[PDB]
DNA sequence: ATCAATATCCACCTGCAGATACTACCAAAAGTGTATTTGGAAACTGCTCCATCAAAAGGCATGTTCAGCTGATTCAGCTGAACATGCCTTTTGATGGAGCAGTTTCCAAATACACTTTTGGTAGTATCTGCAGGTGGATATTGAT
DNA sequence: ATCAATATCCACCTGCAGATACTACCAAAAGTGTATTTGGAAACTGCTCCATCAAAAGGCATGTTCAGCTGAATCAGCTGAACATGCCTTTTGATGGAGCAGTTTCCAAATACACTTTTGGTAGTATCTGCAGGTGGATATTGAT
């Protein structure tokens, strides 16, 4: 059964995040909207992450690449180096 | 011969800090007292965090500080929260909080 | 092969000073390392800029101090500044 | 033949998940979405395991925090059901 | 006796004020406020005229941007009237 | 040096009319009565933050005079960069 | 004698941009093409914004560009707007914009 | 009596290239001067960290280029890289 | 209320993945000793622009009057939560090898320095000009009706 | 519509202060030409750890059922806009003096070696334990009656 990767981010999973976010009741239109939102997040981060990679003349995205991308997106993440 | 850290009463590595300053391109020159002051400050902030994650590990019947403990220590502390307000602690979760209007009719 | 420098040991010492019967996971240590590096950078960066504004070639403890004041919320700054000043004195009152 | 009322379970879920820190997206689906997206900038790329882990912690934290704000926008509207407009409003006000 | 209906002068004002760039707070009053607040931090301070001026530009820009966000927040809640819970909502979402 | 008049309650100098003009430029049509005090409070916090950093730059440069540069640096620190003043 | 700017076919000062890269301690060494590239980039960006502001001066029947024109320029333009997402143009004003629901009738 | 530098003359040149009959007020110019400076710092700074990340002690035209790519959005990035490459090329060949 | 169905919680057992411990060990920072360089506090002072003041030119504070907006009330409908049912995707673990990362090499390109030349800023004194602020006179919007 | 009061518009019209000019100058750039140093691409390669496949492990997808939440409609109270009225405080232009900023002197403190002493990182291997994931029955929370 073929199915887009983005649809791999499932209603329950989305629902689980909302729950951790303290969300009680969820319009069924949310799930698509959330997928749009996560795509743009990843798009933004990976672009920069890669731009680092590429700059290093590498073929592998190191965690550092990601950590540095997040940092400049203003989404600093502790724990994976840096 | 004695270390600069001990010369100052510190656990944090003055010489290292000193090095990291120069090889970091912050200025052409780095004074003698700078690595000391800095290292003192980094020690202090480390103390303050461990202090409180320490308690938070205890308060949950544990004796190993995991990330969650740090997350609780930070987000329950108003100033640490501000200073790390734009930082994500990996595997830290969120604070238990439910908006009251969502609570059932009591 | 290469060396992998980290504040892990010092974090530990301090931890032991404060919570002598308490340990810390691999990942919690990593976070703590990340945090010291972060704070090191923020402070060092701010002091860097301070000297440049004043056309000074050198980063002294005066710059570290002012940086700390700019970077840290009210009380956290207060303590940090005393902690810093102390460590400097204790180092100067040393042969 | 027993049935919990609409909402009661929802909270139970909340307390459980606010209690925990496990990632809530399933690692594989996530990893594919990364590689799919990554392809758009460079072809044939290899990802460190931890790099893909970084991106997950990053992403979920971001969405959970987004949901809190979304939630507050729903509650601002005198609702309890979050809807796309709530998200759009959160995002607009954050500057995204 | 002539009378414009409530809202009609408001829109005139909006057009007028979005069309211009002049500072909207009075200079002197604003300057004393800067001096009051500064004085409470350090006494015997002086200000370059352009420092106050910079402050004033920075502040009116901050407030206007905050009034857009506030406005959107009122309109999310199906009102046309801004009230403090809108301002308060905008500031939390922004993270202030 | 001989006297300088005591400064108090100057937040009230941010009058209702001006707050309303700012709101117009911000595209606001109707304004609840309570807004004016909220805005005063909000501005005050804004200014305290900026001036605190500006004054820190001033003191550090061992000056008695707050300069546009001082303010400009302070706004940058707070991610409210300002063009037009030496920025 | 020929300026590095003229060698590079740039209006912008490559000498300066070099001097400035050194003095700001961004790194130990600053390569020879570094100021060239960056002076070009700056020159470009300024051309691009001079261009659109010029237009806005023209649309308001004015010969001289004032801050409102840079504001109009920048805020009417997806990309520059983003580049200056966290920047305040003194005396800029705002984009004329009023929300639907707030207009009279229906 | 120390002089203050500014990009005013160069800004004025480029304005003449794009809009020959158009003037710039000194306030607007100050704004322009701010923008060059701001963009200068932003790019140079992105480049600084780039070099550091990669343990390289030199900022070359290649570090500028990536910095530009990280910093600028889409069509401005593309165009800026063009203009930047074009000038290096022409400068290299001029010597 | 109680009853019972389901959820949570706290006492106890234990295997092992994760964390502690040790010592070889050994390069590489870090400390120490002396020679060399320069940065920026000090004492002095020119000069700007800040604080302060009287003159004159607009905008705020306040009360009144009511249009119309907010929020309370009611409510009918669809929409999302809960939960049944089997059913296919993810997770976990072992396994060559791709490529990052270690290491030595030597040269294009860097810093360093000294002398020559050019340019960009200012300053004193200049005449030029876009346009803000005013006029009056023509047309559009608004709200009573 | 029909009308009129008020706002909006714009086109022409001096007054000037803001911009553009030029000449004269000079300090600090910036360029230029050997002299000397090295950061890093290039070439060569050991070894992680990343891709990937195969065995084992449970959740997510769908459909049926209806509770209760959202939004529509109605509405009356009362809040916030518009506007007249009374009148004071902000703005703006001119005049000594504080302080900032530009010298210049110089020593206290930083950099530059170089050479000795250690510490912190790896790792190899051994050794240890905190807790995660069960268990069991005890108790708590929700909803039907
Ligand atoms: Mg006071």
PDB file of C-alpha atoms and ligand atoms in Angstrom, chain E residues 35-41 43, chain F residues 6-8, ligand 1:
ATOM      1  CA  UNK E  35      14.891  60.447  32.141  1.00  0.00           C
ATOM      2  CA  UNK E  36      12.654  59.232  34.980  1.00  0.00           C
ATOM      3  CA  UNK E  37      13.309  55.590  34.132  1.00  0.00           C
ATOM      4  CA  UNK E  38      16.980  56.134  33.483  1.00  0.00           C
ATOM      5  CA  UNK E  39      17.424  58.165  36.627  1.00  0.00           C
ATOM      6  CA  UNK E  40      16.044  55.283  38.680  1.00  0.00           C
ATOM      7  CA  UNK E  41      19.027  53.212  37.365  1.00  0.00           C
ATOM      8  CA  UNK E  43      21.595  59.288  38.686  1.00  0.00           C
TER       9      UNK E  43
ATOM     10  CA  UNK F   6      11.916  65.906  40.960  1.00  0.00           C
ATOM     11  CA  UNK F   7      10.663  63.510  38.272  1.00  0.00           C
ATOM     12  CA  UNK F   8       7.572  61.438  38.982  1.00  0.00           C
TER      13      UNK F   8
HETATM   14 MG1  LIG K   1      13.009  58.165  40.301  1.00  0.00          MG
END
